[PDB]
Design a protein around this nucleic acid. Structure first.
Length: 435
DNA sequence: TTACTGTGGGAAAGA
DNA sequence: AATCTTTCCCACAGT
Protein backbone atom coordinates (compact mmCIF):
# COMPACT_ATOMS: atom_id res chain seq x y z
CA UNK A 1 0.00 0.00 0.00
CA UNK A 2 1.29 3.44 -0.89
CA UNK A 3 3.93 1.97 -3.18
CA UNK A 4 4.55 4.58 -5.94
CA UNK A 5 2.45 4.14 -9.06
CA UNK A 6 3.73 4.66 -12.58
CA UNK A 7 0.92 7.07 -13.40
CA UNK A 8 1.51 8.94 -10.19
CA UNK A 9 5.24 9.14 -11.03
CA UNK A 10 4.33 10.62 -14.42
CA UNK A 11 1.98 13.14 -12.86
CA UNK A 12 4.98 14.17 -10.72
CA UNK A 13 7.78 14.27 -13.28
CA UNK A 14 5.57 16.38 -15.50
CA UNK A 15 4.84 18.72 -12.57
CA UNK A 16 8.14 18.68 -10.77
CA UNK A 17 8.18 22.34 -9.95
CA UNK A 18 4.68 22.42 -8.64
CA UNK A 19 4.92 19.34 -6.51
CA UNK A 20 8.50 19.08 -5.36
CA UNK A 21 9.44 20.16 -1.89
CA UNK A 22 12.79 21.88 -1.78
CA UNK A 23 14.78 22.71 1.29
CA UNK A 24 18.13 24.48 1.12
CA UNK A 25 20.60 25.25 3.88
CA UNK A 26 23.36 27.84 3.54
CA UNK A 27 26.27 28.40 5.82
CA UNK A 28 29.96 29.21 6.02
CA UNK A 29 32.57 26.49 5.65
CA UNK A 30 34.36 27.62 8.76
CA UNK A 31 33.45 28.79 12.30
CA UNK A 32 35.64 30.51 14.90
CA UNK A 33 35.51 28.81 18.31
CA UNK A 34 34.47 30.44 21.56
CA UNK A 35 36.77 30.21 24.57
CA UNK A 36 35.56 30.45 28.16
CA UNK A 37 32.04 31.81 28.60
CA UNK A 38 32.09 34.11 25.55
CA UNK A 39 29.89 33.40 22.54
CA UNK A 40 31.34 34.12 19.10
CA UNK A 41 28.37 33.65 16.73
CA UNK A 42 28.42 31.98 13.30
CA UNK A 43 28.46 34.70 10.63
CA UNK A 44 26.81 34.84 8.25
CA UNK A 45 24.01 33.13 10.12
CA UNK A 46 23.16 29.66 8.83
CA UNK A 47 19.73 29.90 7.14
CA UNK A 48 17.19 27.77 5.37
CA UNK A 49 14.87 28.55 2.50
CA UNK A 50 11.81 26.37 1.89
CA UNK A 51 11.49 26.87 -1.86
CA UNK A 52 8.60 25.89 -4.10
CA UNK A 53 4.82 25.64 -4.20
CA UNK A 54 5.13 21.99 -3.19
CA UNK A 55 5.26 23.15 0.44
CA UNK A 56 1.81 24.69 0.29
CA UNK A 57 0.18 21.55 -1.04
CA UNK A 58 1.85 19.86 1.88
CA UNK A 59 0.45 22.50 4.25
CA UNK A 60 -3.04 21.70 3.06
CA UNK A 61 -2.66 17.92 3.02
CA UNK A 62 -1.78 18.71 6.64
CA UNK A 63 -4.46 21.24 7.62
CA UNK A 64 -7.08 18.91 6.17
CA UNK A 65 -5.85 15.51 7.35
CA UNK A 66 -5.69 17.54 10.57
CA UNK A 67 -9.32 18.48 11.24
CA UNK A 68 -10.00 14.78 11.85
CA UNK A 69 -4.09 25.60 19.24
CA UNK A 70 -6.23 26.46 16.21
CA UNK A 71 -3.68 26.89 13.38
CA UNK A 72 -1.10 24.17 14.06
CA UNK A 73 -0.20 23.88 10.36
CA UNK A 74 2.71 26.26 10.95
CA UNK A 75 6.41 25.37 10.91
CA UNK A 76 8.44 24.85 14.06
CA UNK A 77 12.09 24.37 13.25
CA UNK A 78 15.10 23.56 15.36
CA UNK A 79 18.80 23.59 14.57
CA UNK A 80 21.81 22.27 16.39
CA UNK A 81 25.43 21.18 16.22
CA UNK A 82 25.66 17.54 15.28
CA UNK A 83 23.09 15.32 16.97
CA UNK A 84 23.11 16.58 20.58
CA UNK A 85 20.02 18.40 21.81
CA UNK A 86 21.42 20.63 24.54
CA UNK A 87 21.87 23.74 22.36
CA UNK A 88 19.00 22.92 20.00
CA UNK A 89 18.22 26.53 19.16
CA UNK A 90 14.78 27.27 17.81
CA UNK A 91 14.66 28.69 14.33
CA UNK A 92 12.85 32.02 13.89
CA UNK A 93 10.92 32.54 10.60
CA UNK A 94 9.22 35.13 -4.99
CA UNK A 95 8.73 31.36 -4.90
CA UNK A 96 10.15 31.31 -1.38
CA UNK A 97 7.55 29.59 0.79
CA UNK A 98 9.45 30.37 3.98
CA UNK A 99 12.81 31.42 5.32
CA UNK A 100 14.74 31.38 8.60
CA UNK A 101 18.21 32.10 9.97
CA UNK A 102 20.07 30.94 13.11
CA UNK A 103 21.67 34.19 14.33
CA UNK A 104 23.18 33.15 17.64
CA UNK A 105 24.82 29.76 17.23
CA UNK A 106 28.32 29.26 18.66
CA UNK A 107 30.68 26.38 19.44
CA UNK A 108 32.63 26.06 22.73
CA UNK A 109 36.26 25.12 23.20
CA UNK A 110 34.87 22.47 25.48
CA UNK A 111 33.52 20.68 22.40
CA UNK A 112 36.34 18.50 21.19
CA UNK A 113 34.78 18.51 17.73
CA UNK A 114 37.17 19.42 14.92
CA UNK A 115 34.62 19.42 12.07
CA UNK A 116 30.89 19.47 12.28
CA UNK A 117 27.62 20.03 10.59
CA UNK A 118 24.24 21.53 11.46
CA UNK A 119 21.07 19.59 11.89
CA UNK A 120 17.74 21.29 11.21
CA UNK A 121 14.60 19.49 12.33
CA UNK A 122 11.18 20.57 11.12
CA UNK A 123 7.65 20.11 12.48
CA UNK A 124 4.13 21.47 12.11
CA UNK A 125 2.38 23.17 15.04
CA UNK A 126 0.33 20.05 15.71
CA UNK A 127 3.67 18.40 16.41
CA UNK A 128 3.82 16.55 13.09
CA UNK A 129 7.48 15.80 12.30
CA UNK A 130 8.59 16.58 8.72
CA UNK A 131 12.25 15.65 9.14
CA UNK A 132 15.81 16.55 9.98
CA UNK A 133 18.30 17.83 7.40
CA UNK A 134 22.04 18.36 7.68
CA UNK A 135 24.13 21.23 6.55
CA UNK A 136 27.40 20.61 4.72
CA UNK A 137 30.73 20.11 6.77
CA UNK A 138 32.03 22.91 8.93
CA UNK A 139 35.61 23.25 10.14
CA UNK A 140 36.31 24.88 13.47
CA UNK A 141 39.04 27.50 13.71
CA UNK A 142 40.68 29.23 16.66
CA UNK A 143 41.06 32.61 14.87
CA UNK A 144 41.43 33.99 11.35
CA UNK A 145 44.77 32.81 9.97
CA UNK A 146 47.64 35.28 10.04
CA UNK A 147 49.52 33.37 7.32
CA UNK A 148 51.63 35.71 5.16
CA UNK A 149 52.81 33.01 2.73
CA UNK A 150 51.11 29.98 1.16
CA UNK A 151 51.54 26.43 2.53
CA UNK A 152 51.37 23.06 0.75
CA UNK A 153 49.62 20.65 3.17
CA UNK A 154 47.33 23.20 4.92
CA UNK A 155 43.92 21.87 3.89
CA UNK A 156 43.32 24.84 1.64
CA UNK A 157 39.91 23.19 1.17
CA UNK A 158 38.87 25.25 4.20
CA UNK A 159 41.31 28.11 4.59
CA UNK A 160 42.10 29.43 1.10
CA UNK A 161 39.52 30.69 -1.39
CA UNK A 162 39.30 28.85 -4.72
CA UNK A 163 38.63 30.75 -7.95
CA UNK A 164 35.06 29.73 -8.52
CA UNK A 165 33.69 29.18 -5.06
CA UNK A 166 31.07 31.27 -3.30
CA UNK A 167 31.60 33.69 -0.41
CA UNK A 168 29.63 35.92 1.95
CA UNK A 169 30.68 39.53 2.66
CA UNK A 170 29.63 41.47 5.68
CA UNK A 171 30.31 44.80 7.33
CA UNK A 172 30.42 45.50 11.03
CA UNK A 173 30.79 48.86 12.83
CA UNK A 174 33.43 49.08 15.56
CA UNK A 175 33.03 45.54 16.92
CA UNK A 176 29.30 45.87 17.41
CA UNK A 177 27.23 42.78 16.70
CA UNK A 178 23.88 44.51 16.11
CA UNK A 179 25.64 46.51 13.38
CA UNK A 180 26.55 43.58 11.12
CA UNK A 181 25.23 43.90 7.58
CA UNK A 182 25.55 41.37 4.76
CA UNK A 183 25.99 42.22 1.07
CA UNK A 184 22.75 41.07 -0.54
CA UNK A 185 20.90 41.59 -3.85
CA UNK A 186 17.34 42.85 -3.33
CA UNK A 187 15.27 44.14 -6.23
CA UNK A 188 17.99 43.19 -8.71
CA UNK A 189 20.30 45.69 -6.94
CA UNK A 190 23.00 45.44 -4.25
CA UNK A 191 22.18 46.23 -0.64
CA UNK A 192 23.13 45.25 2.88
CA UNK A 193 20.53 43.28 4.81
CA UNK A 194 20.77 42.53 8.53
CA UNK A 195 19.00 39.19 8.42
CA UNK A 196 19.76 37.93 4.93
CA UNK A 197 22.93 37.36 2.96
CA UNK A 198 23.85 36.16 -0.43
CA UNK A 199 26.49 33.79 -1.67
CA UNK A 200 28.64 35.23 -4.41
CA UNK A 201 30.65 33.20 -6.83
CA UNK A 202 34.05 34.83 -6.79
CA UNK A 203 35.62 34.78 -10.28
CA UNK A 204 39.36 35.16 -10.46
CA UNK A 205 40.93 37.00 -13.40
CA UNK A 206 44.41 35.88 -14.45
CA UNK A 207 47.04 38.64 -14.65
CA UNK A 208 47.65 40.13 -18.11
CA UNK A 209 51.42 40.04 -18.11
CA UNK A 210 53.10 38.32 -21.02
CA UNK A 211 55.52 39.50 -23.69
CA UNK A 212 58.19 42.05 -22.74
CA UNK A 213 57.68 41.06 -19.13
CA UNK A 214 59.71 37.97 -18.24
CA UNK A 215 60.21 38.20 -14.47
CA UNK A 216 58.12 35.55 -12.69
CA UNK A 217 56.89 32.38 -14.39
CA UNK A 218 53.63 31.59 -12.57
CA UNK A 219 51.40 31.83 -9.44
CA UNK A 220 48.48 30.03 -11.15
CA UNK A 221 47.13 27.83 -8.33
CA UNK A 222 43.55 29.00 -8.80
CA UNK A 223 43.38 30.66 -5.41
CA UNK A 224 42.54 34.24 -4.58
CA UNK A 225 45.50 36.37 -3.58
CA UNK A 226 45.54 39.96 -2.44
CA UNK A 227 45.85 42.50 -5.17
CA UNK A 228 43.69 40.50 -7.53
CA UNK A 229 40.99 41.37 -9.94
CA UNK A 230 37.88 39.58 -8.84
CA UNK A 231 34.31 39.52 -10.06
CA UNK A 232 31.53 38.84 -7.58
CA UNK A 233 28.33 37.43 -9.10
CA UNK A 234 25.20 36.72 -6.98
CA UNK A 235 24.70 32.95 -7.25
CA UNK A 236 20.95 33.38 -6.97
CA UNK A 237 20.25 36.07 -9.65
CA UNK A 238 22.91 36.83 -12.26
CA UNK A 239 23.54 40.35 -10.94
CA UNK A 240 27.23 41.17 -10.46
CA UNK A 241 29.76 43.77 -9.32
CA UNK A 242 32.33 45.75 -11.41
CA UNK A 243 35.49 43.59 -11.56
CA UNK A 244 37.08 45.06 -8.38
CA UNK A 245 40.45 44.38 -6.73
CA UNK A 246 40.73 42.81 -3.32
CA UNK A 247 43.13 44.41 -0.83
CA UNK A 248 43.88 43.29 2.74
CA UNK A 249 42.99 45.82 5.43
CA UNK A 250 44.33 46.31 8.94
CA UNK A 251 42.62 48.76 11.29
CA UNK A 252 41.02 51.19 8.78
CA UNK A 253 44.13 51.02 6.56
CA UNK A 254 44.26 49.25 3.18
CA UNK A 255 47.83 47.87 3.07
CA UNK A 256 49.31 48.05 -0.48
CA UNK A 257 52.80 46.80 0.44
CA UNK A 258 54.49 45.34 -2.63
CA UNK A 259 54.51 42.01 -0.75
CA UNK A 260 50.81 41.63 0.14
CA UNK A 261 50.31 39.87 -3.20
CA UNK A 262 52.14 36.83 -1.82
CA UNK A 263 49.40 36.49 0.80
CA UNK A 264 46.38 34.33 -0.18
CA UNK A 265 43.08 35.71 1.08
CA UNK A 266 41.74 33.70 4.04
CA UNK A 267 38.65 32.79 6.07
CA UNK A 268 37.34 35.77 8.05
CA UNK A 269 40.04 38.20 6.92
CA UNK A 270 39.10 41.84 6.75
CA UNK A 271 39.41 43.36 3.26
CA UNK A 272 38.29 46.15 0.90
CA UNK A 273 37.41 46.40 -2.76
CA UNK A 274 39.03 49.18 -4.81
CA UNK A 275 38.16 50.21 -8.38
CA UNK A 276 40.36 49.07 -11.25
CA UNK A 277 40.84 52.67 -12.56
CA UNK A 278 40.47 54.96 -9.55
CA UNK A 279 42.56 52.81 -7.21
CA UNK A 280 41.55 55.36 -4.59
CA UNK A 281 37.88 54.34 -4.50
CA UNK A 282 36.46 51.31 -2.67
CA UNK A 283 33.19 49.38 -2.53
CA UNK A 284 31.58 51.01 0.47
CA UNK A 285 28.56 50.60 2.74
CA UNK A 286 26.29 53.47 3.76
CA UNK A 287 22.90 53.14 5.40
CA UNK A 288 22.40 49.68 3.91
CA UNK A 289 23.27 51.22 0.50
CA UNK A 290 26.23 50.16 -1.67
CA UNK A 291 28.07 53.24 -2.90
CA UNK A 292 31.64 53.81 -4.01
CA UNK A 293 34.01 55.73 -1.79
CA UNK A 294 36.99 58.06 -1.85
CA UNK A 295 39.98 57.23 0.33
CA UNK A 296 42.84 59.47 1.47
CA UNK A 297 46.37 58.22 0.67
CA UNK A 298 48.01 58.45 4.12
CA UNK A 299 51.01 56.81 2.39
CA UNK A 300 52.03 55.25 -0.92
CA UNK A 301 51.74 51.77 0.63
CA UNK A 302 48.65 52.64 2.71
CA UNK A 303 45.19 54.19 2.61
CA UNK A 304 42.67 55.58 5.06
CA UNK A 305 39.30 53.92 4.57
CA UNK A 306 36.25 54.30 6.79
CA UNK A 307 34.69 51.32 8.58
CA UNK A 308 31.97 51.35 5.94
CA UNK A 309 34.38 50.10 3.28
CA UNK A 310 35.97 47.17 5.17
CA UNK A 311 34.41 43.72 4.76
CA UNK A 312 35.02 40.38 6.36
CA UNK A 313 35.06 37.67 3.73
CA UNK A 314 34.15 34.05 4.35
CA UNK A 315 33.68 30.95 2.21
CA UNK A 316 30.22 29.57 1.83
CA UNK A 317 28.48 26.23 1.17
CA UNK A 318 24.98 24.88 0.37
CA UNK A 319 23.03 21.67 1.02
CA UNK A 320 19.83 21.00 -0.94
CA UNK A 321 17.19 18.35 -0.33
CA UNK A 322 14.26 17.59 -2.63
CA UNK A 323 11.25 15.42 -1.92
CA UNK A 324 7.68 14.53 -2.85
CA UNK A 325 5.03 12.41 -1.13
CA UNK A 326 3.68 11.16 -4.50
CA UNK A 327 1.23 8.63 -3.10
CA UNK A 328 -0.45 9.48 0.18
CA UNK A 329 1.07 11.62 2.94
CA UNK A 330 3.28 9.22 4.85
CA UNK A 331 3.25 8.73 8.64
CA UNK A 332 7.04 8.68 9.02
CA UNK A 333 9.21 11.73 8.55
CA UNK A 334 11.10 12.12 5.27
CA UNK A 335 14.17 12.83 7.38
CA UNK A 336 16.89 10.65 5.87
CA UNK A 337 16.86 12.09 2.32
CA UNK A 338 19.05 9.98 0.12
CA UNK A 339 21.71 11.93 -1.69
CA UNK A 340 23.06 10.60 -4.95
CA UNK A 341 26.60 11.57 -5.82
CA UNK A 342 27.40 9.80 -9.03
CA UNK A 343 25.85 7.05 -11.10
CA UNK A 344 28.37 4.52 -12.43
CA UNK A 345 27.58 2.07 -15.26
CA UNK A 346 29.91 -0.93 -15.30
CA UNK A 347 29.75 -4.31 -17.00
CA UNK A 348 28.07 -4.46 -20.39
CA UNK A 349 26.01 -6.86 -22.44
CA UNK A 350 22.75 -8.07 -20.93
CA UNK A 351 24.29 -8.08 -17.43
CA UNK A 352 24.94 -4.34 -17.65
CA UNK A 353 24.49 -2.69 -14.26
CA UNK A 354 24.23 0.71 -12.63
CA UNK A 355 26.06 1.48 -9.37
CA UNK A 356 24.70 4.38 -7.38
CA UNK A 357 27.17 6.04 -4.99
CA UNK A 358 25.76 8.44 -2.46
CA UNK A 359 24.79 8.96 1.17
CA UNK A 360 21.88 7.98 3.36
CA UNK A 361 20.63 5.22 1.14
CA UNK A 362 18.38 2.84 3.07
CA UNK A 363 17.00 -0.62 2.28
CA UNK A 364 13.50 0.82 1.59
CA UNK A 365 14.38 2.54 -1.72
CA UNK A 366 13.94 1.44 -5.34
CA UNK A 367 15.67 3.27 -8.18
CA UNK A 368 13.38 4.39 -10.97
CA UNK A 369 14.17 5.20 -14.58
CA UNK A 370 11.58 7.83 -15.38
CA UNK A 371 8.40 5.88 -14.55
CA UNK A 372 10.03 2.45 -14.83
CA UNK A 373 11.01 0.99 -11.38
CA UNK A 374 13.90 -1.48 -11.49
CA UNK A 375 15.27 -4.17 -9.20
CA UNK A 376 17.27 -2.42 -6.52
CA UNK A 377 19.92 -4.17 -4.42
CA UNK A 378 21.03 -2.31 -1.26
CA UNK A 379 24.75 -2.61 -0.46
CA UNK A 380 25.35 0.10 2.16
CA UNK A 381 24.01 3.54 3.04
CA UNK A 382 26.64 4.65 0.51
CA UNK A 383 25.91 2.00 -2.18
CA UNK A 384 23.05 0.75 -4.41
CA UNK A 385 23.05 -1.11 -7.68
CA UNK A 386 20.40 -2.14 -10.14
CA UNK A 387 20.01 -3.28 -13.72
CA UNK A 388 19.24 -1.05 -16.66
CA UNK A 389 15.69 -1.55 -17.95
CA UNK A 390 15.33 -2.38 -21.67
CA UNK A 391 15.01 0.86 -23.67
CA UNK A 392 11.77 -0.49 -25.08
CA UNK A 393 10.08 -0.60 -21.71
CA UNK A 394 11.39 2.70 -20.37
CA UNK A 395 8.72 4.72 -22.23
CA UNK A 396 5.34 4.54 -24.01
CA UNK A 397 3.26 6.96 -26.10
CA UNK A 398 1.91 8.58 -22.94
CA UNK A 399 5.52 9.39 -22.08
CA UNK A 400 7.39 9.27 -25.39
CA UNK A 401 7.62 13.04 -25.45
CA UNK A 402 9.20 13.65 -22.03
CA UNK A 403 11.85 10.91 -22.19
CA UNK A 404 13.18 11.58 -25.71
CA UNK A 405 15.83 14.19 -26.52
CA UNK A 406 14.00 16.32 -29.11
CA UNK A 407 17.40 17.06 -30.67
CA UNK A 408 19.52 13.88 -30.67
CA UNK A 409 16.33 11.84 -30.50
CA UNK A 410 17.75 9.61 -27.76
CA UNK A 411 16.14 8.26 -24.62
CA UNK A 412 17.03 10.17 -21.50
CA UNK A 413 15.25 9.34 -18.28
CA UNK A 414 15.52 11.06 -14.93
CA UNK A 415 16.80 8.83 -12.13
CA UNK A 416 14.87 8.92 -8.84
CA UNK A 417 15.10 6.86 -5.65
CA UNK A 418 11.60 6.07 -4.44
CA UNK A 419 10.95 5.08 -0.83
CA UNK A 420 8.44 2.23 -0.33
CA UNK A 421 5.80 4.58 1.12
CA UNK A 422 5.66 6.62 -2.07
CA UNK A 423 8.11 9.41 -1.31
CA UNK A 424 10.05 10.51 -4.36
CA UNK A 425 13.56 11.94 -4.31
CA UNK A 426 14.88 13.45 -7.51
CA UNK A 427 18.44 12.34 -7.95
CA UNK A 428 19.20 15.39 -9.99
CA UNK A 429 20.91 12.92 -12.37
CA UNK A 430 19.83 11.74 -15.88
CA UNK A 431 20.42 8.33 -17.46
CA UNK A 432 20.86 8.60 -21.22
CA UNK A 433 20.49 5.33 -23.05
CA UNK A 434 23.39 6.13 -25.41
CA UNK A 435 24.84 3.71 -22.84
C1' DT B 1 23.61 54.78 35.94
C1' DT B 2 25.35 49.97 36.70
C1' DA B 3 25.75 44.94 34.88
C1' DC B 4 26.46 42.38 31.34
C1' DT B 5 28.03 41.05 26.53
C1' DG B 6 29.82 40.10 21.35
C1' DT B 7 33.80 41.42 19.00
C1' DG B 8 38.48 42.47 17.55
C1' DG B 9 43.17 43.18 19.13
C1' DG B 10 47.11 41.71 21.97
C1' DA B 11 49.82 38.74 25.19
C1' DA B 12 51.66 34.43 26.36
C1' DA B 13 51.95 29.86 25.50
C1' DG B 14 52.34 25.91 22.44
C1' DA B 15 54.01 24.02 17.96
C1' DA C 1 65.14 31.03 14.60
C1' DA C 2 61.22 32.60 13.12
C1' DT C 3 56.71 32.34 12.45
C1' DC C 4 52.18 30.75 13.05
C1' DT C 5 48.46 28.60 15.93
C1' DT C 6 45.94 28.27 20.32
C1' DT C 7 44.50 30.09 24.31
C1' DC C 8 43.82 34.00 27.46
C1' DC C 9 42.92 38.62 28.56
C1' DC C 10 40.52 42.89 27.80
C1' DA C 11 38.70 47.18 26.58
C1' DC C 12 35.08 49.35 23.19
C1' DA C 13 30.65 50.39 22.40
C1' DG C 14 26.06 48.40 22.94
C1' DT C 15 21.94 46.07 25.00
Amino acid sequence: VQSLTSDRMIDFLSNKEKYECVISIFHAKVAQKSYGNEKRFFCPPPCIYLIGQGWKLKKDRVAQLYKTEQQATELVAYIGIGSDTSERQQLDFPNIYDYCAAKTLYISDSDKRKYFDLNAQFFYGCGMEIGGFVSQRIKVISKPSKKKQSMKNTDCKYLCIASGTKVALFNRLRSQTVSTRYLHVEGNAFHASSTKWGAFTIHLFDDERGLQETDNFAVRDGFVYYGSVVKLVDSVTGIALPRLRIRKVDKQQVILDASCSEEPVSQLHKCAFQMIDNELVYLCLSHDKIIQHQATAINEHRHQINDGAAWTIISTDKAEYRFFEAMGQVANPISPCPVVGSLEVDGHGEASRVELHGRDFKPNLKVWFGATPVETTFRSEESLHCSIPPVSQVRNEQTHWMFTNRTTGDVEVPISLVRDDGVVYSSGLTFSYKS
